């Protein structure tokens, strides 16, 4: 509360460390469904159904331009990428499996880097 604070967690490396995680996600062999925004002209149903599209290139640009206020807003966008994927793709599809794999990969890096 006013004039009553928990001890200050060092957040000075968060930007660099989220960048490193995102590099590792970009270079995973199962990243291909997620590298670029879904083409809303060429994929029927995507625009109407997926209210907040997100992809790694869009996260990279937001990260690079100071549009994440803290590491939690960064994790929310990464998870959005996988939540969108589950919304639109059957579990038993190459893209559906890709999304589950990448989510797992991300959540482990996230825990190991920050928890």
Nearest Cα residue to 78 out of 17, 22, 33: 22
How do the domains of the chain map onto residue ranges? Answer: 1-115
Structural determination approach: X-ray
Instruction: Give whole-number Cα distances, 44 to 13, 57, 60, 74, in Å.
Output: 41, 22, 26, 28
Residues 6+ apart with CB under 8 A from 50: 38, 84, 87, 88
CATH code for the part of the protein at 1-115: 1.20.920.10
Q: CA 97 to CA 100: how far, in whole Å?
A: 5
Report the 10 Å Cβ neighbour count for 85.
Answer: 22
Nearest Cα residue to 81 out of 65, 60, 109: 60
Residue-wise over 24-57: b if at least 16 C-beta within 10 A, else e? ebeebebbebbeeebeeeeeeebeeebeeebbbe
């Amino acid at each position: 509360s006013m004039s009553v604070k928990k001890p200050k967690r060092d957040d000075s490396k968060d930007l660099a460390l989220c960048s490193m995680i995102l590099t590792e996600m970009e270079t995973h062999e199962d990243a291909w469904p997620f590298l670029l925004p879904v083409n809303l002209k060429l994929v029927p149903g995507y625009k109407k159904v997926i209210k907040k599209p997100m992809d790694f290139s869009t996260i990279r640009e937001k990260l690079s331009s100071g549009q994440y206020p803290n590491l939690e807003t960064f994790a929310l966008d990464v998870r959005l990428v996988f939540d969108n994927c589950e919304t639109f793709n059957e579990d038993d599809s190459d893209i559906g499996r890709a999304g589950h794999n990448m989510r797992k990969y991300f959540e482990k890096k996230w825990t190991d880097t920050f928890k």
